[PDB]
């Protein structure tokens, strides 16, 4: 019963500063099960509705938060030579067996580091990689090399996260949407999606676009200005856009942002190649 | 002996779809003798023509293709409090002891990660980064921190893969020639080439330059338009290219594109620094 | 104990550093061992900020960490995956390290995080996955976020954020040149990269994509002073572009990167503004 969970996080989050390594009871267990459903993917930080807007759970973010509070920092083995690291965030693979991994039915390559409270859904791959908090890596989806799915992001079915890609973590403020890559979606090399911004379904992204809070996203042919959204089926690469001139009255320097070169539909998505799109 | 291999793996790779991991035999012994052959250098995905243009030896390409049905999904040892990983690639520095690594000479920096059948040549560097399956990384060649050199990528001698370079793989389909850094290439911190593209011998890379199939390469003082390919000794920056008006009657956005600012020589390259080179 | 002495040492070490190797211990080996104890406790730094706000290199404690190299054979270093090993100089800052030596350095260091031995790391600094080089200083406070890298030498500032992704580039040799410093309570954004001893002066915001080289034109557009190298104090920095020359056909030449300082503001706008805020 997810009712009675959410309401101890609530309150005791609104306690939250006499939360610490002693507390134990219905507190502790209260916050380590709510992580459990989180890293099984039985609850998520953010939901979709069916108008297709995304609404936050804040129960759950304030479960990881307070759990920072009641795990102490401890050596973590495993470095090199036998050295240690010191942190309060155990592994998803803690006490995982080979069951376990047949279980997951995910691939996680030598390199890759998750969280606890991170859902990793089947058939998933993991290249070396770090995925955070709260974070769901939906049905089929690629993290490739050097990738990071920041806290609480949520990463649809099918999507390419290509290599050096930053999906950014959000967990304050609480009512802000973390950053959310819906089904299908290709990112690009080095793309950087970060503040809770949102690229709809069937999106591609070439190598280099950088889509935060305050990024201007330009239709190329409509005109459009759009801020935290790229909208369903566009293709979209990194440009710019004439400033203001300068004080002596020579042409202003240009300033970055994301160009929607393309708006397609799911059946381009299905025939069309990735590079014909970008092309 | 390798023309009898080549055999071995093509009737096998057609044969692909009854081949899993119980599958041992000649067929088993012919994928793990390529590999190793990959892994020293022995042989390479590509050959390099007469003509200046590389091919691919597409049989090489299906002994790794086959050594994914033939290893069996394991646990993998060595992660953080005792944890595993699970995949079916093992490390390239499998039972590699002190004698094998003065053997193979080069420098392998915790955090450094390479499947086997890369072959790494000697006095190169590998920081912490990831070299994947069939990738060729010749003498003398920087592989700095968080850099990946992806599948099958050909990287040459003398060559500054810069923090966070991304060399991107190609393995299917088999025709197509994966990713290549020819000899004394240097690629700026955050650059990226993939999807086949060919930076040709000498050239040089700033930093956030991105190479890919579709990107407009253009010499600044030429006006040549190149695709897919960097031509010898160029210095490349980031830069834009002007777009379409919006039918609102504001101008369009410029788009990304790879600028050539300068086309040296031999001479030109051995004697400049790097950022004398970027400057202009 | 004595730094005068001790750097007498390791300047004539230096000088005769052909006769320094593997086989060499006594003085000279206990003195680099010393200095780079010294720097990894950040109790000596290679650089020092003057009265007057300029950086002044210690030389010789970037000599010494050339000596250990020297001192050092490449050795098994284990922790690999399977039990593989790497092969390395370098030892790792946490040789040795127990629950009492990271309760009393109180840094948090997340599996994933490497950092060298004489790279010094103050309390309240998160290490994520990332990699930390010799003679680094990251001081109070400092987020280092995942895949970043803060190269050799290269000096962190009080309350900095390095996002994802961010490259400081190290600075070891030339001797005289600084290395790359991030002063106190700068915001610098994911896949930024600031390279080759320029500096990011004191409570500076960096958005997004932003890379500073020795040779990247940084254009100020509310004054038009054109900087190379530096940013100034409370600067907000964006990635932009200046228009080319045309091309030889009569059509208008490429845009060329550069980066932006759109806003400068003071430490009270900073304290009182978002990071956020100040890019829009
Ligand atoms: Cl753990
Ligand atoms: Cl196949
Ligand atoms: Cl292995
Ligand atoms: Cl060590």
Same mark, same amino acid.
């Given at each position: 019963?997810?009712? @009675?969970?959410?309401?101890?996080?609530?309150?005791?989050?609104?306690? +939250?500063?006499?939360?610490?390594?002693?507390?134990?009871?219905?507190?502790?267990?209260? *916050? $380590?099960?709510?992580?459990?459903?989180?890293?099984?993917?039985?609850? +998520?930080? *953010?939901?979709?509705?069916?108008?297709?807007?995304? =609404?936050? =759970?804040?129960?759950?973010?304030?479960?990881?938060?307070?759990? %920072?509070?009641?795990?102490? /920092?401890?050596? /973590?083995?495993?470095?090199?030579?036998?050295?240690?690291?010191?942190?309060?965030?155990?592994?998803? %693979?803690?006490?995982? @067996?080979?069951?376990? %991994?047949?279980?997951?039915?995910?691939?996680?390559?030598?390199?890759?580091?998750?969280?606890?409270?991170?859902?990793?859904? #089947?058939?998933?791959?993991?290249? #070396?990689?770090?995925?955070?908090? !709260?974070?769901?890596?939906?049905?089929?989806?690629?993290?490739?090399?050097?990738?990071?799915? !920041?806290?609480?992001? @949520?990463? !649809?079915?099918?999507?390419?996260?290509?290599?050096?890609?930053?999906?950014?973590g959000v967990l304050e403020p609480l009512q802000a949407n973390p950053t959310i890559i819906e089904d299908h979606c290709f990112i690009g090399?080095?793309?950087?999606?970060?503040?809770?911004?949102?690229?709809? $379904?069937?999106?591609?992204?070439?190598?280099?676009? %950088?889509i935060g809070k305050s990024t201007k996203i330009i239709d190329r042919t409509t005109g459009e200005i759009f801020i935290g959204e790229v909208?369903?089926?566009?293709?979209?690469?990194?440009?710019?856009?004439?400033?203001?001139?300068?004080?002596?009255?020579?042409?202003?320097?240009?300033?970055?942002?994301? *160009?929607? *070169?393309? +708006?397609?539909? @799911?059946?381009?998505? $299905?025939?069309?190649?990735?590079?014909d799109l970008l092309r």
């Amino acid at each position: 019963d997810l009712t @009675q969970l959410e309401m101890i996080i609530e309150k005791a989050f609104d306690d +939250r500063n006499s939360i610490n390594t002693t507390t134990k009871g219905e507190i502790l267990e209260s *916050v $380590e099960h709510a992580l459990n459903l989180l890293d099984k993917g039985e609850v +998520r930080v *953010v939901k979709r509705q069916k108008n297709g807007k995304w =609404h936050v =759970h804040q129960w759950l973010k304030k479960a990881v938060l307070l759990s %920072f509070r009641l795990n102490p /920092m401890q050596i /973590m083995t495993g470095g090199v030579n036998g050295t240690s690291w010191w942190d309060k965030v155990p592994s998803k %693979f803690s006490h995982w @067996q080979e069951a376990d %991994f047949k279980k997951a039915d995910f691939r996680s390559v030598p390199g890759a580091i998750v969280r606890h409270s991170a859902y990793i859904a #089947p058939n998933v791959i993991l290249m #070396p990689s770090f995925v955070n908090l !709260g974070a769901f890596v939906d049905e089929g989806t690629m993290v490739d090399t050097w990738a990071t799915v !920041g806290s609480c992001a @949520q990463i !649809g079915k099918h999507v390419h996260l290509s290599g050096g890609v930053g999906i950014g973590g959000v967990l304050e403020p609480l009512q802000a949407n973390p950053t959310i890559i819906e089904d299908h979606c290709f990112i690009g090399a080095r793309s950087e999606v970060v503040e809770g911004c949102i690229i709809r $379904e069937g999106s591609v992204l070439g190598m280099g676009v %950088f889509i935060g809070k305050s990024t201007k996203i330009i239709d190329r042919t409509t005109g459009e200005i759009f801020i935290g959204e790229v909208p369903p089926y566009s293709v979209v690469v990194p440009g710019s856009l004439p400033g203001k001139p300068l004080p002596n009255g020579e042409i202003g320097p240009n300033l970055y942002c994301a *160009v929607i *070169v393309k +708006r397609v539909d @799911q059946k381009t998505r $299905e025939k069309t190649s990735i590079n014909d799109l970008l092309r």
